[PDB]
Design brief:
The structure is a homodimer. Chain A is mainly alpha-helical. Chain A has two domains: 56 residues, cAMP-dependent Protein Kinase, Chain A (Up-down Bundle); 53 residues, Methane Monooxygenase Hydroxylase, Chain G, domain 1. Chain A is 65% helix and 0% strand. Chain A contains five helices and no strands. The longest helix of chain A is centred in the middle third of the chain and has 18 residues. The radius of gyration of chain A is 18 Å and the shape is elongated. Chains A and B meet through helix 1, helix 2, helix 3, helix 4 and helix 5 of A and helix 1, helix 2, helix 3, helix 4 and helix 5 of B. The complex binds chloride ion (2 copies). It is classed as transcription. The entry lists the keywords extended helix bundle, Arcimboldo, transcription. The assembly is dimeric.
């Protein structure tokens, strides 16, 4: 049998993508990190979706992605939304939490 | 106007990030403008088209990550010989933000 790690499906494609990221961002990736591991996992599964011509779950999985990557910004967005609901007394589309999260990420760097 | 509301929202941000926002900075201006658009869309009960809106937000706020995501998507398309949907550029951008920053 062939070890899974030795099934070299798209190994050189993956390496090309990483080189593009490293050149463009002018850094070296941390192959140890959760962010890198999840990036590679995302790419591997995106390859599968592309091969099968599958769409994605546009709204809902964006939420969880941001909750996992930027929990402080994500939860802060929801705290702002809580206050908006309490004062303005209108419903809030969860897309607003996505926008707020993205606007918060740069603030404390 | 929502002046007191805005001040409370900024206080929450400051607490959560354990920082004080410089009120005499582009940082504060950008923040308050975005928040005011959120308020306006909530009050007027106006939905967004999240796919198109996110592409616009990312292009303008995360140009390096977004443009790099598009380069990667083009490589994937050309290698796999399949269509790639615009939403993929969005999801890939969101995975790149924490790599770059
Ligand atoms: Cl965070
Ligand atoms: Cl909703």
């Amino acid at each position: 049998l062939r070890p899974l790690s030795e099934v070299n499906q798209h190994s050189q494609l993956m390496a090309q993508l990483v080189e593009v990221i490293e050149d463009s961002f002018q850094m070296k990736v941390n192959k140890e990190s959760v962010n890198y591991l999840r990036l590679i996992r995302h790419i591997r599964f995106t390859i599968e979706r592309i091969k099968k011509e599958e769409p994605t779950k546009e709204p809902e999985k964006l939420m969880l992605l941001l909750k996992n990557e930027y929990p402080l910004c994500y939860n802060t967005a929801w705290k702002l939304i809580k206050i908006l609901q309490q004062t303005l007394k209108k419903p809030v589309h969860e897309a607003e939490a996505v926008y707020l999260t993205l606007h918060l990420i740069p603030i404390n760097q």
